[PDB]
Amino acid sequence: VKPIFSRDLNEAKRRVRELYRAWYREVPNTVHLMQLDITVKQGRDKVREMFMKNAHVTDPRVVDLLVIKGKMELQETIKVWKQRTHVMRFFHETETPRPKDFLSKFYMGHD
Amino acid sequence: DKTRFAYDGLKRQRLTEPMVRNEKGLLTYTSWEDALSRVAGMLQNFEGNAVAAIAGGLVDAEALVALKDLLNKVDSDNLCTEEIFPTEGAGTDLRSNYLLNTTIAGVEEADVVLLVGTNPRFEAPLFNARIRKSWLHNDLKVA
Amino acid sequence: LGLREIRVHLCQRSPGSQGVRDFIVQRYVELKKAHPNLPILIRECSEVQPKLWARYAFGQEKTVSLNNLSADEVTRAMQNVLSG
Amino acid sequence: LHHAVIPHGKGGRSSVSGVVATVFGATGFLGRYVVNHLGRMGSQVIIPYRCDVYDIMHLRLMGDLGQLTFLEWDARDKDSIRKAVQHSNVVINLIGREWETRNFDFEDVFVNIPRAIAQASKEAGVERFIHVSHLNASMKSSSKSLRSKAVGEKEVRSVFPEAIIIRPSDIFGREDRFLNHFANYRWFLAVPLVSLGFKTVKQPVYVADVSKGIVNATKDPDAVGKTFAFTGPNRYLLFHLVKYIFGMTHRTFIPYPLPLFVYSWIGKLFGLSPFEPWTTKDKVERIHISDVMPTDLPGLEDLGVQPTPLELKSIEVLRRHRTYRWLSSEIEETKPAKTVNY
Amino acid sequence: DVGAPMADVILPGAAYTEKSATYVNTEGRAQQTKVAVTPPGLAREDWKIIRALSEIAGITLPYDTLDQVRNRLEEVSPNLVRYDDIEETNYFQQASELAKLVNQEVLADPLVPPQLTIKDFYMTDSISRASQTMAKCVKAVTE
Amino acid sequence: TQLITVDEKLDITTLTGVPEEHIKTRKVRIFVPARNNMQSGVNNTKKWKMEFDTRERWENPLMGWASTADPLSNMVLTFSAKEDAIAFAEKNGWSYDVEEKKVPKPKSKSYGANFSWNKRTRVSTK
Amino acid sequence: GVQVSPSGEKITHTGQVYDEKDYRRVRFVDRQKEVNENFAIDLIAQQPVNEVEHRIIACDGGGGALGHPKVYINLDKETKTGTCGYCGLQFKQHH
Amino acid sequence: PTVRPRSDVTHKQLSAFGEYVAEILPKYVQQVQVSCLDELEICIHPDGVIPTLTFLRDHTNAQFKSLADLTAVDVPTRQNRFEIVYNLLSLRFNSRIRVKTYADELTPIDSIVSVHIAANWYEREVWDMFGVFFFNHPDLRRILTDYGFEGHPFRKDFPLTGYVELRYDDEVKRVVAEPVELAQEFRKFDLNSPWEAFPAYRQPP
Ligand SMILES: NC(=O)C1=CN([C@@H]2O[C@H](COP(=O)(O)OP(=O)(O)OC[C@H]3O[C@@H](n4cnc5c(N)ncnc54)[C@H](OP(=O)(O)O)[C@@H]3O)[C@@H](O)[C@H]2O)C=CC1
Ligand SMILES: [Zn+2]
């Protein structure tokens, strides 16, 4: 298969570490400048749990495309093309989470 | 014709909500959180061998797996069905005693077909269609 | 405490089910008529690791992977799961 | 249960849930949040509206098509209430004002209108009543609205024995009158407190958590027949509360003490206006009373909703009153107030 | 119609168009009903109901998905997951050698199916007993 | 450039942007469709189609329209090969369920068979 | 001739009546339920049968291309009047 | 008068031009199809798409200076499912050309910014709608999707109705996102007739 940037997994992991460093650098500017209704600590934990959401993939081209999608999110976060509405739909302040046990999923719907 | 014009039964006299025995003696509409709690409360009391389930009919082979595990974990072999098959000799074991062991394509591949049990035209009617197709398209002695 | 049921699986043309095929072709009917209340179920299919599932009381089971045996100790294996 | 009341759906606005809710008094502050939390679930919400159509225009967006229905009524007669509640599953009473007027007083507003709603609801045959009282409601209290709240609780329990009296504490939101009182005290250049805010302990509780408690109390079958008391997770002293409010507003904070009789005289002087008053004597005595220590009462934690504190969501509240010199400052730059159990 | 008015509680399950289920024919072949219409009211799937009954009891059934029920079907009897596949059976001779020792007696009574005529083919097993289509079929036949 | 030598099964979950419940709680059917029985045409059945498990569809409480919980229930998909369809299902990561292609068999049908002397194939009508 | 419900509202020509224990009449308070007074079931027996001198007839619904396509219906059944499947107006054989 | 008249002189002279480009570029051109609609469909290899379009722009006998159109068509039967088109149009020769290459969603296509600055926005639109990496783009910023829209929408595995759906709340006073459940289900119609439509376009078994 043809590569994208990375000939292995650890170089793309270093690119993931660079993007996480730049996101952790960027996010208090987009807490203070955004007039946002959060602190910086659970925003950084939201960045960390969004990194841990796609933690299971060991594929280098998939994580390189995750690197360019995180770079586009970084490009729309360093500049303020995203707003205070778009920037924190990730927190799910309104949508209730779907329950994971069998009994509440039995009570809620045919799933 | 039964299974192609019995779809209209699926929207008539259909149970929708869990129902419970009332204090007066009627059946009233309650929730799953009360009804299954009443089932588990009366299921933890009676145990061992006096818990029985008669299944049968329009019932899944996953439902029998779940019922068989749920009543073998309260160690009862009382899983009875609707219709009677004999288990005095070779009932449940050795799967040639309750199947169509010949293939239904091999119902064409026959010469003499005996029917001791039942008429096929009012009881599994597409088997009567396959035996009529074999009876017409080749010579075949039905008794 | 007792053996509630036993479910024996079987393949069709694999050589790993030949010993339990020898058991089912000669040494089954005397085991069934020694105790007719205890059902020794036979559930065959194609391309299966052959097993015996001796399901005991209260939902527990014992799974013996009855693979690649001879004409000697298959009946000693399920008489061991009957006695134990 | 009927065949249309059966809940199906993931939990959005176009789902069905069967909580056919007559939300009385939904034109104001807690009603907007509870109609949002009821129409987000997927329920049929009927609002008896007393005002013009403009202040209940903004409640039309709260759910799907025909999940919100507005009925014109008046509080003087029981016939429009019986015309409202006879197709209902639950009825949630949120009615009440922070000021009395020439047409309606506190005793009429907190007693006879919930008694008429309870009587027409019982003669119509609803399943669940929820009433909203105050947390500090007792018969021996020194507040007129709290004494009216206690005798209204007695009359609501006298009419309907299975009513869910929810008693929330002081509530803070985007258009409240709790933190907006202390933020409208910024204009008078020196905040007045009874005994410098030291003898009074207040428990702020979030409005979305309160409305989620109401929406969960419409559906929990254990919760029926009970009487609840909503409160926040952290008890606050009043001096540190006004200190935290002006610390995150970043204005000047010069408190000065004047006693309760001249505070009541200045509340009666500010409450004689024909328009909406900035403060009343009852609004002074409601925020200048020590709240009850929470024991032997069910609260917010047993309804499946965790109460968010004052230090997390009051920056959503206080951003209106901030000067541009300290507009963009976040929460942890300011020191949070000390919680006091005493 | 039969088991619900003579009951204590009633738990509504889904129907044959209404659950991802396995059924066996008379040939021994088991196939899967995919779900066509989700079951109305508060009715759920049957193994879903039995697993919720297990969770509300003190019994730990090892199910959380439908695929674990299919894995338990593989673990109990591995013919009900091989879809559209009649499995080749044998070993009738051991069943005949066991059933030859059964000392049972026939007697003089003429054997008969209950679906003797055409008027009772149209009403079997509580769906055709509940539909108004097959009631009109029985009403048209019996004139 | 150089080719990279990896060998794993493919996942494009993060590229496709789907929620996690729409992979982990959904199963997918890969099947040649049945011929519509009032028709006698075969052109529907030359393409391997993909459908999902059907989720809950209730009535809208104002009107009674079909309100679906699932956006994936409207989708059908078209392929021409079963192994290419299983490659698409394995790269998207949904739980596959494949039904094999069932063809008509060649049956010796003749007009002169329908009018035979000793056989039972003589039709009483014409 | 509009029939009334046991609750008190009107019933359409589809036979739809809202039940007494249903919440869906709560959009029906102080806003009128639209029910057409001219039922199409009731406005078909008012016009009499049309006399046909042949064994077949073909209607159009009136107006040619304004009405329906020209279906030839059979008039050989004398015991039952041959209804046009497009309109519903009935034809009777003259002899 | 019903059938469109056919002018085969353009068919043979553009087929001679297609044989010309298929001979002069044997490394990259995989095939050249000529339709019955006097246009050319040169299907090439995606590692060398920039020699193909610099040859089609800069040469005096091709001279397709003006790029017109650029998307994919996503056919999920193929192993490389995206089928990227480049519709180009000569001003001077009054002719048209189509360049079709393939793409997987993991294998990138090197971008054509250095030959046409018309595709400064078309390749960004392709990165939104289908989701292929474009090598050495100046900015491959998302254009047509929402700010924070997870999912390339024009692929066949994306649904019609999407996954998020916006809704205002008064809990937070923002236009928040919810997972979409519909007010009305889009009724999927079986518009494929079951009878055989065209005998010339017949699939062999
Ligand atoms: N002060 C506080 O912070 C707390 C208050 N409470 C009490 O709980 C309830 C919470 O509601 P809340 O949103 O804060 O109060 P609001 O005053 O803001 O809203 C209640 C609504 O009730 C309506 N209403 C009141 N009296 C009448 C009447 N006689 N006739 C018709 N409509 C009437 C008003 O409608 P409109 O004016 O538009 O016609 C008003 O919009 C109230 O009863 C309140 O007293 C509970 C806890 C804390
Ligand atoms: Zn007509």
For residue E42 the two structure tokens come to 């508060």
Picking from D2, D66, D83, the nearest residue to G22 by CB comes out as D2
Residues on chain A touching E45 (C-beta within 8 angstroms): 110
> Ligand 1 atom closest to Cα of D97?
17
- Indicate the domain borders of chain F: 2-126
Using CA atoms of D303, D309, D314, D317 in order, give the dihedral in degrees to the nearest 10.
20
Residues on chain A touching D331 (C-beta within 8 angstroms): 39
Picking from E34, E38, E84, the nearest residue to F55 by CB comes out as E38
Q: Do B16 and D221 touch (CB under 8 A)?
A: no
- C-beta of residue E132 within 8 angstroms of C-beta of residue B10: no
Q: How far is CA D263 from CA D177, D197, D268, F93, in A?
A: 18, 13, 9, 69
A56 CA to chain E: closest CA distance, Å?
Answer: 21
H91 sits in the region (left: phi over 0; alpha: psi -120 to 50; else beta) called alpha
* Three-state secondary-structure class, residue G48: coil
Bridge partners, residue B39, by sequence: none
A41 CA to chain H: closest CA distance, Å?
Answer: 20
Report residue D69: phi and psi, to 5°.
-135, 130
> Ligand 1 atom closest to Cα of D75?
30
Nearest listed ligand to the Cα of residue D111: 1
* Three-state secondary-structure class, residue B105: coil
Q: How far apart are CA D29 and CA G17, in angstroms?
A: 38
Chains in touch with B (3+ beta-carbon pairs under 8 Å) read A, C, D, E, F
Q: How far apart are CA G18 and CA G13, in angstroms?
A: 14
**Cβ neighbour number for residue H91 with a 10 Å cutoff:** 10
Q: How far apart are CA B113 and CA B141, in angstroms?
A: 6
User: Does the CA dihedral E37-E40-E42-E47 come out positive or negative?
Assistant: negative
Report residue H19: phi and psi, to 5°.
-65, -35
Q: How far is CA F86 from CA F10, F51, F94, H77, in A?
A: 12, 13, 10, 10
* Per-position DSSP letters for H147-192, written without gaps between them: TT--S-TTSTTS-SS-SEEEEE-SSS-SEEEEE---SS-------S
Residues on chain E touching D2 (C-beta within 8 angstroms): none
Number of domains comprising chain D: 1
User: Does the CA dihedral H12-H14-H17-H18 come out positive or negative?
Assistant: negative
Q: How far apart are CA E10 and CA B15, in angstroms?
A: 8
Residues near D241 by Cβ (< 8 Å), separated by ≥ 6? D182, D197, D202, D204, D310, D337
Provide the residue type at G35 as one letter.
V
> Ligand 1 atom closest to Cα of D171?
3
The C-alpha angle with vertex A79 and arms to A75 and A80, in degrees rounded to 5, equals 120
- C-beta of residue B34 within 8 angstroms of C-beta of residue B28: no
Resolution number, Å? 3.7
Q: Do A40 and D332 touch (CB under 8 A)?
A: yes
What is the CB-side half-sphere exposure of residue F37 using CA atoms within 13 A? 1
Supply the residue whose CA is at minimum distance from atom 2 of ligand 1: D170
Q: How far apart are CA D324 and CA D250, in angstroms?
A: 10
Q: How far apart are CA E131 and CA E141, in angstroms?
A: 16
For residue B94 the two structure tokens come to 């050795």
CA of G61 to the centre of ligand 2 (A): 5
CA of D111 to the centre of ligand 1 (A): 13
Q: How far apart are CA D126 and CA D92, in angstroms?
A: 11
Query: Pick from D237, D210, D217: which is nearest to D306 by CA?
Result: D210
Physical contact, G and H (3 or more Cβ pairs within 8 A): no
Residues on chain E touching D3 (C-beta within 8 angstroms): 41
Chains in touch with A (3+ beta-carbon pairs under 8 Å) read B, D, E, F, H
Provide the residue type at D42 as one letter.
G
Supply the residue whose CA is at minimum distance from atom 37 of ligand 1: D51
* Most ligand 1 atoms within 8 A of CB, residue of D23, D95, D280 to mutate: D95
User: Does the CA dihedral F18-F21-F23-F29 come out positive or negative?
Assistant: negative
- C-beta of residue A73 within 8 angstroms of C-beta of residue A47: no
Report residue B117: phi and psi, to 5°.
-75, -65
Kind plus residue range of the DSSP H or E element containing B71: helix B63-72
- Indicate the domain borders of chain G: 1-94
What pairing do the DSSP bridges indicate for beta strands B141-142 and C40-44? unpaired
What chain C holds in terms of domains, given with CATH numbers, is 1-83 (3.40.30.10)
Q: Do D328 and A32 touch (CB under 8 A)?
A: yes
HEC sequence for chain D: CCCCCCCECCCCCCCECCCCEEEECCCCCHHHHHHHHHHCCCCCEEEEECCCCCCCCCCHHHCCCCCEEEEECCCCCCHHHHHHHCCCCEEEECCCCCCCCCCCCHHHHHHHHHHHHHHHHHHHCCCEEEEECCCCCCCCCCCHHHHHHHHHHHHHHHHCCCCEEECCCCEECCCCCCHHHHHHCCCCCCCEEHHHHCCCEECCEEHHHHHHHHHHHCCCCCCCCCEECCCCCCCEEHHHHHHHHHHHHCCCCCCEECCHHHHHHHHHHHCCCCCCCCCCHHHHHHHCCCCCCCCCCCCCHHHCCCCCCHHHHCCCCCCCCCCHHHCCCCCCCCCCCCECCC
HEC sequence for chain A: CCCCCCCCCHHHHHHHHHHHHHHHHHCCHHHHCCCCCCCCHHHHHHHHHHHHHCCCCCCHHHHHHHHHHHHHHHHHHHCCCCCCCHHHCCCCCCCCCCCCCHHHHHHHCCC
Q: How far apart are CA E99 and CA B97, in angstroms?
A: 11
Structural domain that includes position D310: 1-342
Query: Pick from F48, F50, F51, F52: which is nearest to F82 by CA?
Result: F48
**Cβ neighbour number for residue H168 with a 10 Å cutoff:** 14
* Three-state secondary-structure class, residue F31: strand
**Is any Cβ of chain E less than 8 angstroms from the Cβ of C31?**
no
A23 CA to chain E: closest CA distance, Å?
Answer: 37
Q: Largest Cα–Cα distance of chain B, in whole Å?
A: 67
D198 lines ligand 1 (CB under 6 A): no
What b/e string do you get for G64-75 counting C-beta neighbours within 10 Å, with b at 16 or more? eeeeeeeeebeb
Task: Please compute Rg for chain A using Cα positions.
Answer: 17
Query: Pick from D299, D304, D324: which is nearest to D249 by CA?
Result: D324
Residues on chain A touching E63 (C-beta within 8 angstroms): 102
For residue H181 the two structure tokens come to 């459940």
D27 lines ligand 1 (CB under 6 A): yes
- Which residue has tokens 């339920």? G33
Report residue E60: phi and psi, to 5°.
-90, 95
* Three-state secondary-structure class, residue F99: strand
Nearest listed ligand to the Cα of residue G62: 2
Q: Do D37 and H171 touch (CB under 8 A)?
A: yes
Q: Do G27 and D72 touch (CB under 8 A)?
A: no
Specify the DSSP class assigned to residue E10: B
If you measure CA to CA, which chain E residue comes closest to A108? Answer: E42
Q: How far apart are CA G15 and CA G3, in angstroms?
A: 10
Task: Please compute Rg for chain B using Cα positions.
Answer: 22
What pairing do the DSSP bridges indicate for beta strands B79-80 and B141-142? unpaired
Residues on chain D touching H185 (C-beta within 8 angstroms): none
